Symmetry: D2
C-alpha cells in the first residue's frame, strides 16, 4: 500500500560497480546496495559512504550501503553483476571463462536466495557465457537474465563517428549484433548521422577503421590506463539498461538475450536487437540480414558455442 | 561578431578527485573539460577522458573531455579546479608535505595564469587553507578570483549524519562549518536545522556532539575504510556546486575558503567563512555575530592555520 | 508488467491541472490521466495530446491522456484534485464553499470507486475545508488525504527574500502555518538565508512588508492577470508534494494535515509542518511556539472553522 | 576584467507558446528570461513572469524572469524568440492574418535588432516560412542568425505516432519533415527508423500513410480539440531544443527553416531543411539525395510557400 523505492544491488565494488552505484543513486532510480567479498568489506563501505555524503550537495534522495552480507540484498528489484576479471590483450579466453564462471555460480546462488523475483543484468566477461551461466544457475525465465555488450560497443562507435563528422553524438546511431571484438557484427547500413546512412558520408576505408577501432575499443582504454579496464562508459551502459527496466521504457537496445529460434539459433545467449521494459527482455527483434551479415553472425555464434564448451 | 561558445573548465590533477569532478562537470553540461596531469600520467589521463567521452552517447550529454599534460590546452579557461598534490607517505614529516604541495601549487599556478589570465580558481589540494593561500599569492589575482573548498564537503557529511539520525531528506537538512578542514573545522549547530527547525530541539546534545565529532573525523572515517587514498565522490560533488555557483552566477550562500582582510578579527589568511559565491567569485564574506564559545572554537582553528602557514617557504 | 509505472490522475484540466500534468510527465514520475467534465473532454484530450507530442523533444518516457471517464483513472497511485469553480459575479462566499463542497464529494466518490488505495493531494479552495470534505467522504486513513497551501506560500516568501538579499532561492527557507491569506502565519523565526536568521539580515520594516506580500501573494497575481489565478507556482508546489510521496523522500514540508491533538486542535485540517513520504503524512511535527505565534495560529484556526461552518 | 554572467533570452509574445517557452528555459537555467508583449498586456505579462519566478524555489532553479512592454529590457539578448502574432478570430480572412503578422514581424524585429544587434533570432509566428523571411529581410543580419521552427515540432508529432503504433520509447524513433508548417510538409519515411530499423520493415503501408497524414493534420487536430487556440506544449518544447543547440554550441542535425541560396535547387526563400544548428546558428544546410517522388513533394511545398510570399505587402 506504501510507495516504496526500487532496490538495486550492484555486485562487485571495483571501478565499474562503484561508478554504476553512484550514477543510479544520483538519478534516484532507487536505493543501492554495493556488494563485494568479505575481505573487501571496508573499502566497499568507504565507497558507499562517500557516495551517500555527496547526496546533500547533488540533492538526490537515495540510500547507498556497502556490504559483504547478501542478506542486505533481500528483495532487490534488479541486481547488476560486475564481479570478476576484465578483458585484456593476449589473455587466455579459457582462463577468463574458468575463474569467472565459478564467480557467476557463487554470486547467482546468493542473489536468488535473497531476491527470488529479481531481474539480473550481467557485465562479467566473457558476457555471453557468463550471462548463460547466471541464466542456468538462477533457474529464471529468459526475460529476467540480461547481458550488457551492445550498448557499450554502439557508444564507442557513435563517439568515433561523432568526432569524425564533428556533430552531436545525440544524432549519430550504431547497430551491433553479437559480442565484443572479432564476435562483433555491426550493421553500418543501419547506422546514421541525423537519419543519413554513414555509408553516404564516410569512405569505406575510414568506416572500416572506425569499425576495427570499435572492435578493440576496450583494449584502447586498457592501453591508456596501464593497470585497469574501462569503467565510465561500461557503467553508463548498465545504467541505461537498468533505467529501461525500472521505468518500463520499452527501449530498443542491443542486449545479450537467450535465443529459442530467433535468427535460426537456439540454446544460446547472443547480442541481438531487443525491446527492454518492466518485464526485462519483452522481445528479441529478428532483422532480414543479407547473405554476408548472416555469414558474419554464424561466425560470431561458433565463437559463442566455443566459449560455452569451456564451461565446466 | 561573436558566435555562442562553450564554457571551459580545466581540472589540474586527474586522480580520484579530479576525474570524479570532470565526469560530473561533463554530465551536467557546464562546459568542455580539460583534465591535466604530469607527463608521466599523460596516458592514464587520456584513458579516463576518452572513457568519460564514450559514456556521453548513453547518458546523453554534449561535452568535450580531453586528458593532456600540455597546459596550453587549458588556454582561456573560465574556471580551473586544482586537485594536483601529493599524499603524506609514512616517514614524510608534516613540514615536507606542506612544502612539497606548496611547490606544486606554485608550478601549477604559474602555468594556469600564463594560459588563462582571466580564469577563476578553486583549490582542493591539502593542506587547503595554506595551499589556497599559496595559489592566491602566486596568481597575482585579486582575492575574489581564488577560492578554496572545504566547508561544502564538511556541511555535506554533517547533513548526511543528521538526515540518517532523524530519517528525513538530506534536502531539508542545513549545516554550517567554518574554520580549517579536518580537526580544525568548526561545525556551528546553532545555524543547523531540519526543515528550519533547530537541531538542538530534535536531537539530544550527546548524540549531536557525536555527529559534530563524526563530521570532524569524516575524512579519516573514509581514509580508514578505503586503504588507499582519501574521499573523492563528496569532494568532487562539493567542487561541482562551487563551479555551478560561478559559471551560472547563482549567488549561493555557502562556506568557502576566502582571503580575510579584517572579517572575524583576522587579516592575511585564507579561512573557511560564510561566502556569497557568484559570477565574480567570492562576492562577500558574511560576518556572523558569534558567541564567545563559537569565537573561541574559530580562534583555535585560526591558530592551526597560522601553524601550517609558518611551514611555507 | 512486474515494474509498473506509477499512475497519477489530475482532476481538473484548467491552468493548475494542465501545468501540474506537464511537469509530472517531464520528470518521468509516472503516467498522467488528465480529467475534466464531459463538456471539456475535447480541450482536455488536446492539452494531453499536445504535452505527449513534446515527449520526443524534451526526452521523457510518459503517457498522458485526457478523459471525462473516471474508469481511465483506475489504480492511480496519487490523485491531485484541482476541480473547482471560478467564483461568479453576484455569488456569496457561502455558495462558493457550498458549490466546491459538492464538487469534492462527487469527485471523491469517483476517485475511491476506481482507486480506493490512492493518496489524494487537494488544491481546490477553500483548501482546508475542501481537503476536510475529501477526507470525510473518502473514509481513508488521514495520512492518505493531504492539502497544498504552505509550500506555495513558503515559495513566495523565499522569492521575495531572495530578491531582497540578491541570493539563490536554493539558500532561502521559510515556514508558513495556518491557511492562505490573512489566515496564514509566516514564522520569520524559522526563516533563514544560508542558515542565517533573516531577522539578522533584514530590518523589521522590510521583513514585515515581505510577510504582508506573502499574505497577499495570490491576490497580487490575480490583480496582474485580470482573468484567472496563479498556476505556475501552484503546480510546482503540487509536483514537489507528489515527488515526496512517489519517491518516499520524507521531506519536512508545510502541508494541510488532519489534527488529533497537535497544537491543541482536533477534528480539523490545518497547515502544519509535516514529514511527507511513501505513506503520505508520516507525522505532524509540533513546534514550541511563543505565546504570540500561538495567538496568530488560533486566529487562523478560528478562520478555518468559520469556513467549515459554511459546509452543508 | 569581465565577471561570468548568465545568458539572456528575450521571448516576444507572452501568449500560450511564449509563456510555456519562458517557463521551460528558466527551469533548465539556460539564462535569464525577458517576456515581452504589447503595453495593454504588460500586467498579465508581469503576472506570468512573477508566477514562474515564484516556482523557482520549489523546482530549485536560479533564473530571473521579468515581464515588460519596453524593448530596452531586451538589451544585449544572446537569443530572441519571436512568438508574437495576431490572435486568430472567427471570420478573419487569410490575407488579414498574413498581412497583419508581417507588420508585427517588421515592427518587432526593428526593436529587437536595435537593442540586441548581435543576437540569434528563432521565429515561430505563422505563417512561419514567410514570417522568418520577413524577420531576415528586416533585421539585415546574415542568414545564419535568423532561424525558423517547424520541422522539430512536426518530426515530434510523427515520432509520437510511430512510438504509439510500435509501443516503444519516442527516444528510439527518428523522423525527418521538410517544407512548410502546413498540409504541404514532407515527412520522409525513408529517412525514419525505430532503433535504426527502417519503418517500412515494421509498419504496414496503410498504417504508415495514415501516420504521415496525421503528421500533416497535426496542428489542426490540436486546434479542433482545444476549440479556441492552437498547440503550445510541443511548440514551446521545439523552441527550447533549438535555443539549447545554439547556447551550448551542440551542432545538432535537426530540420529548421533556413535561407536557401542554391540548396535543393531553390534560391531566395526560407524552407524547412536539414540543418546543423550550433553556436553560430544555422552552420550548414545538409542536402539529402531525394528521389524524384521526394523532389516533387518538396517542389509542391515550395509552391505553397511562394504563394504566401506573393501576399506579402
Ligand atoms: N560487458 C562489457 O562490455 C564489459 C566492459 C567492462 C568490463 N567488463 C567486465 O566487468 C568488470 C569490469 O571490471 P571491474 O571494474 O568490475 O573490475 P574490478 O576488479 O575493479 O572489480 C570487480 C570486483 O569483483 C570482485 N569479486 C571477485 N570475486 C567475487 C565474488 N566471488 N563475489 C563477489 N565479488 C567478487 C573483485 O574482488 C572486485 O572487487 C569485469 O568483470 C569485466 O569482466 C565487461
Ligand atoms: N579540500 C577538501 O575537502 C579535500 C577533500 C578531498 C581531498 N583533498 C585533497 O585533494 C588532493 C587530491 O586528492 P586525490 O585523491 O585526487 O589525490 P590523487 O593522488 O588521487 O590525485 C592527485 C593527482 O595530482 C597529480 N599531480 C601531482 N603533481 C602535479 C603537478 N605538478 N601538475 C599536475 N598534476 C599533478 C598526480 O599526478 C595525481 O594524479 C590532495 O591534496 C587531498 O588531500 C582535499
Ligand atoms: N491551494 C492553493 O495554493 C491554490 C493555488 C491556486 C489555485 N487554487 C485553487 O485551485 C482550483 C482550480 O484552479 P485553476 O486556476 O486551475 O482553475 P480552472 O478554472 O482553470 O480549472 C478548474 C477546472 O476544474 C474543472 N472542474 C469543475 N468541476 C469538475 C468536476 N466535477 N470534475 C472534474 N473537473 C471539474 C473545470 O471544468 C476547470 O477546467 C480553484 O479552487 C483555485 O482557487 C488553490
Ligand atoms: N511555427 C510553428 O510551428 C507554430 C506552432 C505553434 C504556433 N505558431 C504560431 O505562433 C504564434 C503564437 O501562438 P500562441 O499560441 O502563443 O498565440 P497567442 O495569441 O496566445 O500569443 C501571441 C501573443 O503575441 C502578442 N503580440 C502580438 N503582437 C505583438 C507585438 N507587436 N509585440 C509583442 N507581442 C505581440 C499578443 O499580445 C499575444 O499575447 C502564432 O502566430 C501561431 O500561429 C506556429
Amino acid at each position: 500500500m506504501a510507495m516504496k523505492r526500487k532496490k538495486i544491488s550492484v555486485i562487485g565494488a571495483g571501478f565499474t560497480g562503484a561508478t554504476t552505484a553512484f550514477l543510479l543513486a544520483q538519478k534516484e532510480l532507487g536505493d543501492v546496495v554495493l556488494v563485494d567479498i568479505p575481505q573487501l568489506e571496508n573499502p566497499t563501505k568507504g565507497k558507499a559512504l562517500d557516495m551517500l555524503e555527496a547526496s546533500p550537495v547533488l540533492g538526490f534522495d537515495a540510500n547507498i550501503i556497502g556490504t559483504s552480507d547478501y542478506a542486505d540484498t533481500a528483495d532487490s528489484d534488479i541486481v547488476v553483476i560486475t564481479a570478476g576479471i576484465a578483458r585484456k590483450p593476449g589473455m587466455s579466453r579459457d582462463d577468463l571463462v574458468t575463474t569467472n564462471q565459478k564467480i557467476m555460480k557463487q554470486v547467482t546462488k546468493e542473489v536468488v536466495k535473497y531476491s527470488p523475483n529479481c531481474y539480473i543484468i550481467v557485465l562479467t566477461n566473457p558476457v555471453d557465457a557468463m550471462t548463460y551461466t547466471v541464466f542456468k544457475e538462477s533457474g529464471f525465465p529468459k526475460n529476467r537474465v540480461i547481458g550488457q555488450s551492445g550498448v557499450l560497443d554502439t557508444a564507442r562507435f557513435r563517439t568515433f563517428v561523432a568526432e569524425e563528422l564533428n556533430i552531436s553524438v545525440k544524432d549519430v546511431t550504431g547497430f551491433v549484433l553479437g559480442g565484443h571484438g572479432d564476435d562483433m557484427v555491426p550493421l553500418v547500413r543501419y547506422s546514421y548521422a541525423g537519419g543519413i546512412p554513414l555509408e553516404k558520408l564516410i569512405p569505406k576505408d575510414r568506416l572500416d577503421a572506425i569499425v576495427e577501432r570499435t572492435r578493440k575499443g576496450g583494449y584502447e582504454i586498457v592501453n591508456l590506463l596501464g593497470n585497469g579496464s574501462a569503467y565510465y562508459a561500461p557503467a553508463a551502459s548498465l545504467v541505461e539498461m537498468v533505467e529501461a527496466i525500472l521505468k518500463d521504457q520499452r527501449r530498443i537496445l542491443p542486449a545479450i538475450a537467450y535465443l529459442e529460434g530467433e535468427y535460426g539459433y537456439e540454446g544460446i545467449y547472443l547480442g541481438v536487437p531487443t525491446i527492454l521494459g518492466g518485464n526485462g527482455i519483452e522481445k528479441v527483434i529478428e532483422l532480414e540480414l543479407t547473405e554476408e551479415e548472416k555469414a558474419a553472425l554464424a561466425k560470431s555464434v561458433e565463437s559463442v558455442k566455443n566459449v560455452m564448451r569451456m564451461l565446466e
